[PDB]
Amino acid sequence: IQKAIEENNNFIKMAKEKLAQKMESNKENREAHLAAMLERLQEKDKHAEEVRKNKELK
Amino acid sequence: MRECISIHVGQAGVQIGNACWELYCLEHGIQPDGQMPSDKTIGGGDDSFNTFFSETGAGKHVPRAVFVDLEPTVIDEVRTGTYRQLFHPEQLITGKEDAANNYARGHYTIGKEIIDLVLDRIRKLADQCTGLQGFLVFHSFGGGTGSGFTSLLMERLSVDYGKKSKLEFSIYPAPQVSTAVVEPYNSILTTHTTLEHSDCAFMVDNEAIYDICRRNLDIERPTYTNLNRLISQIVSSITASLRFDGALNVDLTEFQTNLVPYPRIHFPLATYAPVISAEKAYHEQLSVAEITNACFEPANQMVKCDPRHGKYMACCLLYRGDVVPKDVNAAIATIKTKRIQFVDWCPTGFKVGINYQPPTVVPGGDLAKVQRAVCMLSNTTAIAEAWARLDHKFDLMYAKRAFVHWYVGEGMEEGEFSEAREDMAALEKDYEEVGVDSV
Amino acid sequence: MREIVHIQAGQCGNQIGAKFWEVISDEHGIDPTGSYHGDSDLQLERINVYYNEATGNKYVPRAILVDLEPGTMDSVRSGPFGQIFRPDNFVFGQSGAGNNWAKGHYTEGAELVDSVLDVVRKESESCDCLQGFQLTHSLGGGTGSGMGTLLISKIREEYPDRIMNTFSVMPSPKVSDTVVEPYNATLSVHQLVENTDETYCIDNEALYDICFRTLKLTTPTYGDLNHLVSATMSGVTTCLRFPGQLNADLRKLAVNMVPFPRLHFFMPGFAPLLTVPELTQQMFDSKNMMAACDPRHGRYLTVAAIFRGRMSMKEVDEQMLNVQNKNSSYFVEWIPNNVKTAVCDIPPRGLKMSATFIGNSTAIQELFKRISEQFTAMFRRKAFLHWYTGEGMDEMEFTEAESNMNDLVSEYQQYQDATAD
Ligand SMILES: Nc1nc2c(ncn2[C@@H]2O[C@H](COP(=O)(O)OP(=O)(O)OP(=O)(O)O)[C@@H](O)[C@H]2O)c(=O)[nH]1
Ligand SMILES: Nc1nc2c(ncn2[C@@H]2O[C@H](COP(=O)(O)OP(=O)(O)O)[C@@H](O)[C@H]2O)c(=O)[nH]1
Ligand SMILES: [Ca+2]
Ligand SMILES: [Mg+2]
Ligand SMILES: [Mg+2]
């Protein structure tokens, strides 16, 4: 009966840890995906500032 | 004691839940306002129908059910429909933005925002139970909530309730009513994630139910309402041992012992008879022998596959209505000769149960009200054909990485696709190993 | 609950945008004063997708009218349904774009872009659950092509997790307004490839050939072309506006239609221009496509079919299976079940039954090859480049746009020649 208790608790523990691992890994990946999207849009804004500056120098 | 909590996830799960709970009320004489005049013990009791219904002091019989969807459209119809007074508002949980047929959105992006509320509401039902037996989770494979949120919920139920039993009713995708190209992806992902958290799963192939409505009920273009009323009859047959009592009644968990020889081999094939229109049932009573012989006709199966090309590891017959063992034994003896190959490590007997409560039909439906019905639950290697068809469609799209960006964009990795597919590959190999003769 | 914010920019965008609101207001039973005088509850069940509810049970379109000149927008306010738009949602300039993409994207349009974003946020902040945005514009002009692709980029910064849909009108020499149109189209495609989730290609060359050859119009006007656009836009948005379960919102449509993020340019189709077999056959014919591409010159990645009117769903199911079996060569094998069919009971105005076709076909490269050929025929001689370098651009940005659109065609060809085994 001690082995049955230990096996059930290990199942609960492994499941709780795998899920927290997945939810944390997923949170970082989605945030990294969104941070790369904004950085590309912000580099397009810097290129727009250089275009308007290049015209000012003409 | 022995209470059962039902959890209906996503559109398919919810709409099938509507069909099942309506059917249950008809079977137990419960009115749309929850009142049950035949129930004399007010406020509670230990009757067989209390495994599925709790009682309030005002005489209302409340389903032990939770309806969860990530959008409100489908559950709003429950909140305003015929049985709106049957459910307490806290049992109907909705979000605002669905999972867009994306497993990752149901398991992570959208589903993580409501999972704590759902588990809290499930806890409220469990606290009302004096001896909770387990959960019944109803969901589709193909939808983003049905697949993703169900996997997240099953994982969390294992944590919050240990090894307490969890049974699934899973809608396998069919192109005739499918709404998303990526349904093979969602199917493989949720099956891999739930496999170690589920004790027993009853797959319902929408194409098998579609063909049955077209062939046996003469419905030209079946709707979800056509499919769900048929699905609820099978669900009713499976749960009838929990909700009714009888001398010849065999508890579902006693069938489950025979149906699951190994933890991963837990997908019974269900077959139901008779499915017959009123026009054809008039002056044509189907005997115990006729409905039993229809259980071995592959066209009556809930999953398209050929058991004739597989091996049996278990065969359970669940009769309801006017059925006595003498007729059953006679009908079985006929079938054992005219039809059934077992694996060499399993006894060849048929496990029989009989609930004398006669079948019920929903008013305005297409099923005839018959005097006797039967659901066969068999464990056959042939059900692995349904995994093969689904795994083939997965491979076609994934070899080109088609649509995988919708999943990576929500935080998933390609490694989860390959890890899930390899689990299915091992599952197919497991179904082959159990069929090989011993040495 | 699931709201779409509509934006129309430039001359073409405001023109087809006004025609779009006139058609769907009629289908939803909305008069030019914003009141509901319909007869079916199916018209108001999903009315909040395109309409806000105001005081007096009024329905105000969730639309934002943008242009760098007041000429086109003044006629919208005076035309039919001109009083139904919110007066504050009119954002117009004075200088204009002069059919110059650089002017709409970098100089003139960037001075106005902030005042448009103020209206976008005001409409988005009151949304119960914003789906995303849809833009109507032309790619051959200046305001719709330049400031349109600019607005797309700026909105995607504040709403990166929302769907960006565009109804983009491709330029054609048969309806040519200027000569620098291949420059504006290539520069706009360069942006639409990166910052949109789904783009309907409304090709002017296809619209002209339909009016001339099929509709028998020797001198097609812009009003004749826009009648095809309104019927097409009404079709592709049917599943968004009426109760249903297939492609009922912008994201489920994208998930069904876009197997790879860059290949998100759809070929629209309409029929008729009458039985279910004939309606299905004409819907897959090249002469009914709103893009100048022969689908039998490529392969279908995904397809959305929409049938409208009272008909046999059993017959529609059989005819859609029939056309896929008899034409299986034109559907990629590595995407099973890539054709989805929706049925709506409410037909368009003046038809017993109609069909709308949304296709992601690799034959769309014929459209991008034509614009790339008109682009390289001018860029190799540096023609008209002073219109753009004068605003601050350089030849590098032109080459990058050319290379990106040529990569789009290569990618469409890659999946056309891909096999299952
Ligand atoms: N048998 C049956 N199948 C259904 C029903 N509703 C949807 N389906 C099937 O379920 C799959 C789609 O999943 P849904 O349940 O609609 O999706 P969902 O769980 O709500 O997830 P999202 O809407 O993407 O957030 C398709 O295979 C449909 O054919 C139903 O009422 N009965
Ligand atoms: N179908 C259609 N095309 C148009 C319409 N108006 C302009 N166009 C096309 O749009 C291009 C010119 O863009 P335009 O809208 O005038 O530039 P903008 O005002 O700066 O956005 C040309 O290639 C025309 O063919 C219209 O009402 N209908
Ligand atoms: Ca009681
Ligand atoms: Mg849903
Ligand atoms: Mg113009």
Side-chain angles (χ1 to χ4, degrees):
Chain A
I1 185 167
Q2 286 164 17
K3 185 179 170 190
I5 294 171
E6 174 73 297
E7 288 178 340
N8 184 39
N9 293 338
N10 278 322
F11 175 77
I12 294 176
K13 187 188 68 175
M14 297 309 181
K16 177 192 285 281
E17 296 174 348
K18 288 180 186 176
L19 188 48
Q21 150 70 23
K22 286 199 303 185
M23 298 307 282
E24 185 62 26
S25 181
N26 182 279
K27 178 184 179 59
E28 299 175 357
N29 294 356
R30 193 176 181 275
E31 285 171 348
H33 171 263
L34 288 180
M37 185 184 308
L38 295 182
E39 186 169 355
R40 287 188 304 264
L41 295 170
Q42 292 165 11
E43 288 295 336
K44 287 296 183 177
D45 291 354
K46 295 184 186 64
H47 178 80
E49 297 286 349
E50 300 178 16
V51 168
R52 285 179 293 272
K53 172 181 172 53
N54 185 33
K55 177 186 183 180
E56 194 76 6
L57 300 184
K58 295 174 177 295
Chain B
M1 211 72 53
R2 295 158 65 179
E3 297 94 354
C4 291
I5 296 172
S6 307
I7 306 173
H8 307 280
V9 178
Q11 177 179 123
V14 167
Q15 289 181 167
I16 290 173
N18 288 330
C20 293
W21 285 103
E22 176 178 17
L23 187 53
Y24 292 162
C25 291
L26 298 177
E27 296 183 1
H28 296 293
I30 297 168
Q31 303 167 2
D33 61 353
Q35 298 292 328
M36 177 178 177
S38 60
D39 189 9
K40 305 306 175 182
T41 55
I42 313 300
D46 59 330
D47 297 306
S48 292
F49 64 86
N50 285 124
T51 62
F52 274 57
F53 293 84
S54 60
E55 303 185 31
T56 66
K60 176 173 289 185
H61 293 63
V62 178
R64 307 180 189 274
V66 185
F67 288 63
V68 50
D69 203 359
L70 295 181
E71 60 128 349
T73 298
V74 183
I75 292 182
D76 285 337
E77 292 301 295
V78 179
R79 285 165 178 145
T80 62
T82 306
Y83 290 88
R84 64 184 182 279
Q85 307 159 11
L86 205 69
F87 307 95
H88 182 277
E90 289 183 339
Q91 298 165 253
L92 313 180
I93 312 162
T94 48
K96 289 180 173 295
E97 190 177 14
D98 62 10
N101 297 324
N102 191 332
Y103 170 98
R105 292 177 66 81
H107 189 296
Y108 305 95
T109 308
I110 301 305
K112 76 187 169 58
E113 299 300 326
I114 202 179
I115 181 64
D116 291 317
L117 177 58
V118 172
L119 288 171
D120 178 78
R121 300 290 173 80
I122 293 170
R123 175 64 63 183
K124 280 180 167 53
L125 291 185
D127 287 354
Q128 299 180 350
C129 297
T130 64
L132 174 65
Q133 194 173 14
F135 305 90
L136 306 189
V137 191
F138 299 77
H139 68 100
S140 70
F141 275 165
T145 306
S147 62
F149 188 72
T150 298
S151 295
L152 175 61
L153 174 66
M154 296 287 281
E155 282 168 320
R156 293 284 290 270
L157 287 183
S158 295
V159 172
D160 295 11
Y161 298 88
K163 281 184 176 303
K164 182 139 295 186
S165 68
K166 300 198 283 306
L167 273 56
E168 289 180 277
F169 285 94
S170 301
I171 304 309
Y172 182 97
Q176 287 93 346
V177 290
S178 62
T179 53
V181 186
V182 297
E183 292 197 33
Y185 285 163
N186 299 331
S187 299
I188 273 64
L189 292 170
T190 186
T191 295
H192 160 64
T193 304
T194 309
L195 195 50
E196 69 187 324
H197 303 278
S198 185
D199 299 293
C200 195
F202 300 98
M203 280 186 299
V204 189
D205 182 356
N206 261 346
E207 188 176 341
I209 301 302
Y210 200 82
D211 291 346
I212 289 166
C213 287
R214 283 199 298 185
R215 189 200 316 111
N216 302 348
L217 299 180
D218 297 319
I219 306 175
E220 283 192 354
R221 209 293 180 181
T223 67
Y224 287 146
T225 304
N226 297 129
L227 307 186
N228 292 346
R229 287 178 175 178
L230 174 56
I231 294 172
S232 64
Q233 294 294 345
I234 290 95
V235 172
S236 181
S237 296
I238 295 173
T239 64
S241 50
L242 306 178
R243 300 176 292 106
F244 295 103
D245 55 326
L248 303 181
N249 186 32
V250 170
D251 205 74
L252 180 56
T253 55
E254 192 166 303
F255 294 114
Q256 185 177 343
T257 296
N258 285 12
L259 288 167
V260 180
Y262 306 93
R264 294 166 56 89
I265 309 302
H266 65 246
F267 294 96
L269 178 59
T271 308
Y272 182 85
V275 181
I276 182 180
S277 66
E279 288 81 3
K280 293 295 186 303
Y282 189 69
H283 292 353
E284 192 184 54
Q285 299 292 339
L286 297 94
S287 64
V288 171
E290 288 167 308
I291 63 172
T292 309
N293 197 29
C295 290
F296 297 87
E297 168 62 33
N300 298 321
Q301 292 159 188
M302 251 48 66
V303 178
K304 300 189 75 178
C305 64
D306 195 357
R308 180 173 45 87
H309 298 164
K311 296 193 178 184
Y312 284 95
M313 294 167 289
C315 201
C316 305
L317 295 168
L318 285 61
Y319 289 94
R320 67 187 309 179
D322 179 63
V323 175
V324 300
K326 164 175 175 291
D327 304 325
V328 177
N329 299 331
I332 293 176
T334 304
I335 294 182
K336 284 187 174 305
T337 63
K338 297 178 177 176
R339 294 282 189 173
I340 308 175
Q341 186 180 5
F342 279 79
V343 298
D344 66 8
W345 49 264
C346 171
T348 65
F350 291 4
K351 187 177 166 52
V352 173
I354 300 169
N355 287 270
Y356 280 94
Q357 301 291 330
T360 310
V361 297
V362 173
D366 302 310
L367 272 174
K369 181 164 164 51
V370 298
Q371 287 186 115
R372 62 193 64 81
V374 62
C375 181
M376 187 171 77
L377 303 177
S378 62
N379 181 19
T380 162
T381 62
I383 202 162
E385 293 167 16
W387 304 126
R389 293 190 307 269
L390 220 42
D391 288 336
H392 180 56
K393 297 176 168 181
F394 183 99
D395 293 338
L396 288 175
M397 293 186 300
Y398 191 68
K400 312 295 182 295
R401 296 301 187 275
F403 304 98
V404 180
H405 68 100
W406 290 110
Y407 298 76
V408 174
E410 298 293 356
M412 287 190 56
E413 305 176 359
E414 291 190 359
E416 310 182 53
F417 280 74
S418 54
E419 161 186 330
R421 180 63 182 88
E422 291 163 8
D423 202 8
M424 302 300 304
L427 189 58
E428 289 195 39
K429 182 181 181 182
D430 293 338
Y431 273 95
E432 294 178 14
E433 293 173 352
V434 299
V436 177
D437 294 321
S438 307
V439 181
Chain C
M1 50 160 301
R2 291 279 286 165
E3 296 91 2
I4 293 175
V5 176
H6 170 86
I7 299 180
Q8 41 188 76
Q11 184 180 29
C12 176
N14 282 276
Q15 203 63 225
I16 71 188
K19 290 304 192 304
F20 166 73
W21 287 104
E22 295 175 20
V23 174
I24 67 169
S25 301
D26 171 78
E27 300 184 358
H28 291 284
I30 311 294
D31 54 60
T33 66
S35 299
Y36 173 77
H37 284 99
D39 50 67
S40 178
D41 295 358
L42 305 180
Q43 302 174 292
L44 292 181
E45 189 171 330
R46 305 190 69 190
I47 195 70
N48 303 130
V49 181
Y50 283 96
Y51 295 85
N52 291 319
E53 192 166 359
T55 311
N57 296 18
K58 296 290 188 174
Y59 295 93
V60 185
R62 191 175 305 106
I64 304 176
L65 300 85
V66 186
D67 202 351
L68 282 170
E69 63 178 11
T72 310
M73 289 174 51
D74 286 358
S75 58
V76 179
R77 198 182 298 100
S78 299
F81 292 88
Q83 308 300 321
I84 204 182
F85 293 101
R86 190 171 183 260
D88 289 354
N89 286 28
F90 289 77
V91 185
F92 52 89
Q94 298 294 342
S95 58
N99 298 128
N100 195 325
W101 185 90
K103 277 200 170 187
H105 198 78
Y106 288 112
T107 66
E108 319 293 337
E111 306 161 359
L112 197 62
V113 70
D114 288 358
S115 53
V116 180
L117 296 174
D118 294 355
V119 187
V120 177
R121 297 181 194 94
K122 191 169 183 179
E123 291 281 2
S124 296
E125 189 178 4
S126 61
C127 287
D128 181 60
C129 181
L130 176 67
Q131 302 189 39
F133 307 87
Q134 66 173 46
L135 171 69
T136 61
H137 63 158
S138 59
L139 304 187
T143 306
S145 61
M147 195 182 177
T149 55
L150 181 65
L151 277 169
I152 296 173
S153 182
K154 304 298 292 179
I155 293 173
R156 204 157 182 85
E157 296 186 32
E158 300 189 35
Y159 305 89
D161 59 334
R162 303 297 185 193
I163 296 297
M164 187 67 57
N165 184 221
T166 72
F167 298 76
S168 304
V169 179
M170 311 290 167
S172 175
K174 302 174 184 181
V175 205
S176 172
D177 278 335
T178 172
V179 199
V180 297
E181 284 182 3
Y183 284 164
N184 305 329
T186 299
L187 295 168
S188 303
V189 168
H190 179 57
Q191 304 294 322
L192 297 179
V193 167
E194 309 290 340
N195 297 328
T196 67
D197 300 307
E198 43 198 17
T199 286
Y200 298 92
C201 299
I202 310 295
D203 194 0
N204 261 342
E205 182 147 342
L207 298 175
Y208 178 86
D209 295 1
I210 294 174
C211 294
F212 190 86
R213 307 177 187 176
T214 302
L215 302 182
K216 304 297 181 179
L217 296 177
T218 56
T219 58
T221 57
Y222 281 109
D224 304 328
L225 307 182
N226 291 347
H227 198 240
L228 301 176
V229 182
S230 69
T232 292
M233 290 187 60
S234 178
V236 302
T237 64
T238 302
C239 298
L240 312 175
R241 301 185 284 104
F242 291 110
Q245 290 163 343
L246 172 74
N247 299 324
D249 61 70
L250 296 173
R251 187 173 275 99
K252 281 182 165 175
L253 176 68
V255 174
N256 271 348
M257 292 301 295
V258 183
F260 308 97
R262 294 170 53 88
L263 312 178
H264 61 263
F265 301 92
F266 307 151
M267 179 188 303
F270 192 84
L273 292 179
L274 183 57
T275 66
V276 173
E278 296 169 335
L279 186 56
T280 300
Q281 186 181 15
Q282 297 184 23
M283 182 181 53
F284 278 88
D285 188 11
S286 67
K287 298 194 297 294
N288 296 44
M289 300 305 178
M290 303 303 171
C293 308
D294 194 352
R296 284 175 171 87
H297 295 176
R299 300 173 79 189
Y300 282 119
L301 298 174
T302 57
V303 171
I306 310 174
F307 290 88
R308 302 185 64 184
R310 292 186 66 258
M311 64 201 76
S312 179
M313 190 175 304
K314 170 176 175 292
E315 191 175 13
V316 172
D317 288 358
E318 294 174 339
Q319 296 309 313
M320 289 301 298
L321 290 173
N322 185 75
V323 72
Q324 294 178 80
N325 298 333
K326 294 182 174 180
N327 299 281
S328 65
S329 305
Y330 305 102
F331 298 91
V332 293
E333 298 181 337
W334 39 277
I335 303 178
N337 308 117
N338 56 348
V339 185
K340 302 295 176 184
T341 304
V343 175
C344 179
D345 289 330
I346 299 180
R349 187 183 187 178
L351 295 171
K352 290 283 190 177
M353 51 180 56
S354 74
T356 306
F357 171 91
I358 308 172
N360 193 345
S361 171
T362 66
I364 198 69
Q365 62 178 326
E366 293 181 336
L367 178 148
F368 295 115
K369 280 182 178 180
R370 181 194 72 203
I371 295 176
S372 182
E373 188 174 15
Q374 303 165 353
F375 180 90
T376 189
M378 298 176 59
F379 186 69
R380 68 174 61 259
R381 65 175 191 262
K382 312 300 183 60
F384 298 91
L385 282 187
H386 66 277
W387 287 24
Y388 305 91
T389 51
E391 308 294 333
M393 297 182 63
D394 53 332
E395 302 184 21
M396 183 65 179
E397 185 171 349
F398 272 81
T399 302
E400 295 170 355
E402 184 183 20
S403 302
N404 192 23
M405 189 169 59
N406 293 325
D407 291 335
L408 185 60
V409 173
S410 300
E411 296 165 28
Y412 275 116
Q413 185 66 38
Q414 170 186 357
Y415 294 112
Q416 180 165 322
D417 298 326
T419 61
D421 301 336

